[PDB]
């Protein structure tokens, strides 16, 4: 039941994506059922919404060129990248139709918790975990926050727990 | 509603390839289905799917010429010269058809080693991004079988594909920005 | 939308869901007037209370479900909103709030004749 | 189930009265059981009280003269007048004894809703709705509001629904 | 009497269109059935009816030429140049047939959105008198698929229609004065 480094969400922030098999690879490891718990915290005075989604086989695309992305841009690992363009999900698929994937809404007025159980989803019964990014956990702030003053931290923390890894 | 099933939604039987040759001499087309953006976008909606090909080769010339169309799966060698000894090999599907007859038809069964084709592959091969080595099917090489008549020929070949027996998995949102290349999904 | 560009004949009831995203403290009322295609879209509030409308209050409820009666596509209807009262927020929260609209067809939604799409080049 | 125009309650505000048969007359109309729902909204930081009352046969009186009021001062209609003197209810009857009529208390600390059902109350079985004001819905702010800053809007909205009008 | 049923009374299979083209280059004919006054008067007798088409295209030339005949329903785009990319679309019925073979045959099912075709429409569209927007069926575009041989061609196309599976409603008195146009019923 591992936890990652907490990220800071402000007005200028624009999204986060982890690759699930890889981002969890560099912590004490070498059929996997992923469980993901995402919880931010704010007071009653803050406001804003998010969108926690877990996209399978999410293949990115480089912006406005013909070069495929490299080893370092894809597998950043355990830090999690940032969307250059969240509105098109870095591949041209619209965010407005992105609710087809398993997703939950963190709306800071109602709740501040989300939990998604991710099953094993691959054509082959085996998988090379060093050469394959199975899921992509992505959170996207739709409605940015705001107080009377400048923006706050409102830290977000992702907790991942697999089952039966090998 | 019998109309909107996925087995009926992807059975359009559209064109994929059309490249002529004048009398190098033989036509070799890879079987990747990402040829036309009309059919490619309809396959963007699903993650994993499984089907068979049902190739139809239509041939018109601008004369009683005989054509050979050979299918070569992955791993086997592909010919480079028209009279090569790979054409004489019998360990691969070949069909011999004329022009005057109705056009040829041959179906290609599901030949991935996994349970389904992976349309999207977030991973690397060896060490390439977005290339699954178990995804590709092969290629069909079409040559002519005649001594060439020293007159004005223009042999134009059209290839059609009807994917049937469809099964689909994990629907995905469609693409709204136009394509940059056919190797990946840039914008 | 992106599915029903492929087909050319459609019929079925639609459902719209709105969602508020302001702070905990803020309240205020809204009305959502639906207008059939046989009537004009009311640009004044006093004529807008004649049509089918619902009084929505963020505060007591954070979301709302609006059912559209169905009509087939043969060859137009409007869903409009009106600010009922002025928004009141506390001194600490920001003043600007937000709304988000959802859409989903019901189970009587049907498609008949398949054609190519003009959406992509 | 009609709604009226929302009014703004401030410190300087001093009361509101509608005539029920008349104020509802000018909306799509020409045994009536009235139902009245009154709801204001405020945060936890505001404070103050109201008094929603429904006075039958409320006959007004002109201030400090001998002239009876006219057609325009009585039947204002759908806007609702304002008390010139709420403490004597514009007729000399004290506000302190005004709880004999059907009434509810909107106290912004406890609740912000009130609902009064008004039955048919006339000697004759028929009534001329163009020449007779049956009830008078009156709200009176007893304790005015207050924050650290100046006064707020705290809008009040009256919703009226008859049953079996003709 | 098996002779005088309405299913047998309107099954004549007459000609509707005959327009050649010399080697603009492709033939586009609207599917309105008000082509010949012989068949048009037999449809004047009924108000509402319902059927299917069974098109047959007969082709003679004045040579091993291949012909494509594409059917386009209403709402979809129609091509304007012979090599346009609308011909490559697979979301519409196409048939590829030679000249030497027996002629092609294809049936078109009932595609109005109402219960029957309205032959007479006392009403307006938008804002036209006598035009029902759910009445029209589409059009078939016939092109050739060859590089043109620079010799004297004369390709003449004939189209036949057998309306079968007829159902009729509300018989009407026949027309005695001759026609003025094909848009309406002037005299």
């Amino acid at each position: 039941f591992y936890t990652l480094k907490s990220v800071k969400w402000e007005t200028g922030s624009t999204g986060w994506w982890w690759k699930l098999p890889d981002a969890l690879n560099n912590i004490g490891m070498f059929r996997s059922g992923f469980l993901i718990h995402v919880q931010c915290n704010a007071t009653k005075f803050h406001q804003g919404a998010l969108l926690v989604v877990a996209i399978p086989e999410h293949q990115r695309g480089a912006h406005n060129t013909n070069t495929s992305p490299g080893f370092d841009d894809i597998m950043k690992g355990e830090e999690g990248g940032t969307f250059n363009h969240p509105y098109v999900l870095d591949d041209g698929t619209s965010l407005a139709c992105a609710t087809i994937f398993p997703h939950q809404w963190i709306n800071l007025r109602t709740n501040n918790s989300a939990t998604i159980v991710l099953p094993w989803m691959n054509a082959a019964p085996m998988d090379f975990p060093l050469r394959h990014n199975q899921w992509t956990l992505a959170i996207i702030p739709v409605v940015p926050l705001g107080t009377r003053t400048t923006s706050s931290m409102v830290p977000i923390t992702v907790s991942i727990a697999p089952m039966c890894c090998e | 509603v019998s109309e909107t099933l996925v087995e009926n939604f992807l059975s359009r039987a559209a064109l994929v390839s059309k490249r002529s040759f004048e009398y190098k001499n033989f036509f070799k087309w890879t079987i990747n289905t990402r040829s036309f953006v009309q059919l490619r976008r309809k396959l963007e909606l699903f993650t994993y799917l499984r089907f068979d090909a049902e190739i139809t080769i239509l041939t018109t010339v601008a004369p009683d010429l005989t054509l050979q169309a050979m299918f070569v799966p992955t791993g086997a060698l592909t010919p480079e010269k028209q009279d090569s000894f790979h054409w004489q090999s019998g360990s691969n599907a070949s069909v011999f058809f004329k022009i005057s007859d109705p056009p040829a038809r041959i179906t290609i069964p599901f030949m991935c080693i996994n349970s389904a084709y992976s349309v999207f592959y977030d991973g690397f091969a060896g060490f390439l991004y977005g290339i699954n080595p178990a995804d590709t099917i092969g290629n069909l090489c079409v040559r002519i079988v005649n001594e060439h008549q020293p007159v004005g020929f223009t042999v134009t070949v059209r290839v059609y594909m009807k994917p049937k027996h469809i099964k689909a998995w994990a629907p995905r949102p469609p693409r709204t920005l136009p394509y940059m290349s056919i190797a990946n999904a840039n914008y | 939308g992106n599915i029903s560009r492929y087909y050319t004949h459609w019929s079925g009831s639609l459902e719209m869901t709105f969602m508020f995203c302001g702070s905990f403290m803020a309240t205020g009322k809204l009305i959502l007037c639906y207008t059939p295609p046989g009537g004009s879209c009311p640009t004044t509030r006093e004529t807008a209370m004649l049509g089918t409308h619902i009084v929505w209050d963020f505060g007591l409820q954070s979301s709302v479900t609006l059912i559209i009666p169905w009509i087939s596509g043969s060859h137009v209807g409007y869903v409009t909103c009106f600010m009922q009262t002025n928004l009141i927020v506390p001194s600490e929260s920001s003043d600007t709030c937000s709304l988000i609209g959802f859409i989903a067809a019901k189970d009587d939604f049907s498609l008949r004749l398949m054609r190519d799409s003009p959406d992509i080049g």
Side-chain angles (χ1 to χ4, degrees), chain A, chain B, chain C:
Chain A
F1 189 75
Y2 297 97
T3 177
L4 290 176
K5 182 63 70 69
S6 298
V7 299
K8 294 177 177 65
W9 174 46
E10 294 177 354
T11 303
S13 293
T14 186
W16 295 273
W17 57 270
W18 291 268
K19 299 296 183 181
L20 294 174
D22 181 65
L24 177 63
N25 198 4
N26 294 319
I27 300 171
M29 286 176 67
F30 296 97
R31 300 278 76 80
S32 298
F34 291 97
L35 187 142
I36 287 173
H37 181 76
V38 173
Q39 180 177 3
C40 66
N41 48 356
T43 66
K44 283 92 174 65
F45 294 103
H46 296 92
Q47 56 95 30
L50 298 179
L51 181 64
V52 179
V53 72
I55 301 167
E57 297 289 331
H58 178 64
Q59 179 176 358
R60 296 176 62 89
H63 176 74
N64 200 1
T65 177
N66 293 319
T67 303
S68 65
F71 181 79
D72 200 7
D73 298 334
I74 295 300
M75 290 180 181
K76 291 175 95 288
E78 195 269 332
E79 294 177 354
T82 304
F83 292 99
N84 295 315
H85 298 284
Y87 180 71
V88 297
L89 290 171
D90 297 334
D91 52 351
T93 66
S94 295
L95 192 148
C97 299
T99 58
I100 185 66
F101 300 124
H103 70 284
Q104 285 182 355
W105 290 92
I106 294 173
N107 187 1
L108 292 173
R109 188 177 185 180
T110 298
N111 51 355
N112 52 2
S113 176
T115 298
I116 292 96
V117 176
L118 293 172
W120 178 255
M121 170 144 168
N122 195 314
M126 294 300 293
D127 183 73
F128 291 156
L130 297 171
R131 293 291 187 272
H132 186 78
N133 298 117
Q134 183 57 75
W135 295 92
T136 299
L137 175 62
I139 63 172
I140 296 167
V142 172
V143 176
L145 62 102
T147 60
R148 58 94 178 170
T149 179
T150 184
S151 299
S152 66
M153 283 73 74
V154 289
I156 301 169
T157 301
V158 177
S159 298
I160 300 170
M163 62 87 71
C164 296
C165 65
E166 295 291 326
Chain B
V1 175
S2 296
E3 177 67 32
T4 66
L5 274 82
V6 183
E7 197 272 333
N8 201 8
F9 183 74
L10 301 175
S11 177
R12 294 177 68 250
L15 192 146
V16 288
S17 175
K18 184 256 286 181
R19 181 65 185 91
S20 178
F21 55 93
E22 193 273 336
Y23 283 168
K24 296 294 289 184
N25 305 117
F26 72 80
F27 178 80
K28 186 180 68 65
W29 161 52
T30 322
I31 313 272
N32 240 343
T33 188
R34 292 173 296 180
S35 176
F36 286 170
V37 298
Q38 180 62 46
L39 194 37
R40 184 180 176 182
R41 186 178 180 270
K42 290 178 69 66
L43 272 311
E44 297 284 322
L45 273 79
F46 302 102
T47 304
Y48 294 156
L49 82 159
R50 181 173 179 175
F51 57 92
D52 53 356
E54 191 176 0
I55 308 299
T56 298
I57 296 170
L58 183 59
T59 304
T60 57
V61 296
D64 50 351
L65 285 44
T66 304
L67 276 74
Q68 177 179 3
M70 179 177 68
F71 174 70
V72 174
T74 56
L77 282 80
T78 63
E80 68 269 14
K81 189 174 174 65
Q82 181 175 0
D83 52 354
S84 297
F85 63 96
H86 294 93
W87 294 95
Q88 296 178 357
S89 178
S91 299
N92 49 357
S94 295
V95 56
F96 289 93
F97 65 100
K98 269 75 70 179
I99 294 173
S100 299
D101 293 332
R105 183 188 290 270
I106 180 171
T107 184
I108 301 170
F110 175 65
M111 292 192 292
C112 176
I113 62 173
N114 297 322
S115 295
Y117 294 110
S118 297
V119 177
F120 290 86
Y121 186 77
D122 193 7
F124 288 154
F127 290 98
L128 295 174
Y129 184 69
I131 295 171
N132 195 0
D135 196 7
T136 182
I137 305 167
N139 47 355
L140 57 91
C141 295
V142 175
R143 76 179 175 100
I144 205 163
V145 280
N146 282 112
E147 178 65 31
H148 56 85
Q149 293 301 110
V151 291
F153 280 162
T154 301
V155 181
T156 305
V157 176
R158 294 180 180 88
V159 180
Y160 291 92
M161 292 185 67
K162 185 191 284 187
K164 61 180 180 292
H165 294 280
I166 311 293
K167 293 181 183 291
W169 288 275
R172 287 191 63 171
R175 183 177 176 90
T176 63
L177 274 77
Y179 290 94
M180 295 298 109
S181 298
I182 64 168
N184 49 5
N186 292 319
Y187 60 94
Chain C
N2 286 316
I3 300 298
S4 64
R5 296 289 173 87
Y6 290 162
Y7 296 99
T8 191
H9 290 165
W10 65 275
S11 63
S13 296
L14 276 75
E15 185 270 328
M16 295 179 70
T17 302
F18 295 97
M19 186 178 73
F20 184 76
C21 290
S23 68
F24 191 35
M25 297 296 180
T27 63
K29 292 187 287 295
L30 293 171
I31 61 171
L32 298 177
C33 297
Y34 175 72
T35 299
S40 177
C41 184
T43 61
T44 64
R45 179 182 172 271
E46 293 291 327
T47 63
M49 66 181 73
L50 190 146
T52 298
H53 68 279
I54 190 66
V55 176
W56 179 46
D57 176 75
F58 54 92
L60 194 289
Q61 286 179 353
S62 295
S63 299
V64 66
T65 299
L66 184 60
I67 303 298
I68 303 300
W70 67 276
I71 188 67
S72 66
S74 66
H75 295 287
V76 294
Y78 291 99
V79 176
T80 185
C81 178
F82 287 97
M83 182 66 79
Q84 177 57 72
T85 64
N86 196 4
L87 177 65
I88 56 98
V89 293
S91 66
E92 179 66 29
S93 176
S94 177
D95 51 352
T96 301
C97 295
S98 299
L99 294 175
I100 296 168
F102 293 160
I103 189 162
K106 299 294 287 184
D107 51 354
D108 56 351
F109 191 75
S110 66
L111 285 317
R112 294 184 69 252
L113 188 37
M114 183 176 175
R115 67 184 171 90
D116 49 352
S117 177
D119 198 5
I120 196 64

mmCIF file of all heavy atoms in Angstrom, chain B residues 5 38 158:
data_model
loop_
_atom_site.group_PDB
_atom_site.id
_atom_site.type_symbol
_atom_site.label_atom_id
_atom_site.label_comp_id
_atom_site.label_asym_id
_atom_site.label_seq_id
_atom_site.Cartn_x
_atom_site.Cartn_y
_atom_site.Cartn_z
ATOM 1 N N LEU B 5 -24.926 -3.184 -34.099
ATOM 2 C CA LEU B 5 -23.965 -4.099 -33.495
ATOM 3 C C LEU B 5 -22.574 -3.863 -34.054
ATOM 4 O O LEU B 5 -22.417 -3.403 -35.185
ATOM 5 C CB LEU B 5 -24.347 -5.555 -33.721
ATOM 6 C CG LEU B 5 -25.304 -6.172 -32.713
ATOM 7 C CD1 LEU B 5 -26.743 -5.829 -33.037
ATOM 8 C CD2 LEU B 5 -25.082 -7.667 -32.634
ATOM 9 N N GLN B 38 -10.482 7.420 -43.086
ATOM 10 C CA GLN B 38 -11.871 7.082 -42.817
ATOM 11 C C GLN B 38 -11.974 5.787 -42.029
ATOM 12 O O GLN B 38 -12.692 5.713 -41.028
ATOM 13 C CB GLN B 38 -12.654 6.974 -44.119
ATOM 14 C CG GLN B 38 -14.092 6.630 -43.886
ATOM 15 C CD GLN B 38 -14.785 7.700 -43.098
ATOM 16 O OE1 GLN B 38 -14.636 8.887 -43.378
ATOM 17 N NE2 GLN B 38 -15.517 7.292 -42.076
ATOM 18 N N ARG B 158 -6.712 -2.827 -57.253
ATOM 19 C CA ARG B 158 -7.418 -2.317 -56.090
ATOM 20 C C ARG B 158 -7.637 -3.448 -55.099
ATOM 21 O O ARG B 158 -7.971 -4.566 -55.491
ATOM 22 C CB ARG B 158 -8.753 -1.708 -56.484
ATOM 23 C CG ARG B 158 -8.605 -0.476 -57.327
ATOM 24 C CD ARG B 158 -9.939 0.124 -57.705
ATOM 25 N NE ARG B 158 -9.745 1.316 -58.517
ATOM 26 C CZ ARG B 158 -9.632 1.298 -59.838
ATOM 27 N NH1 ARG B 158 -9.698 0.148 -60.494
ATOM 28 N NH2 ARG B 158 -9.448 2.426 -60.507
#
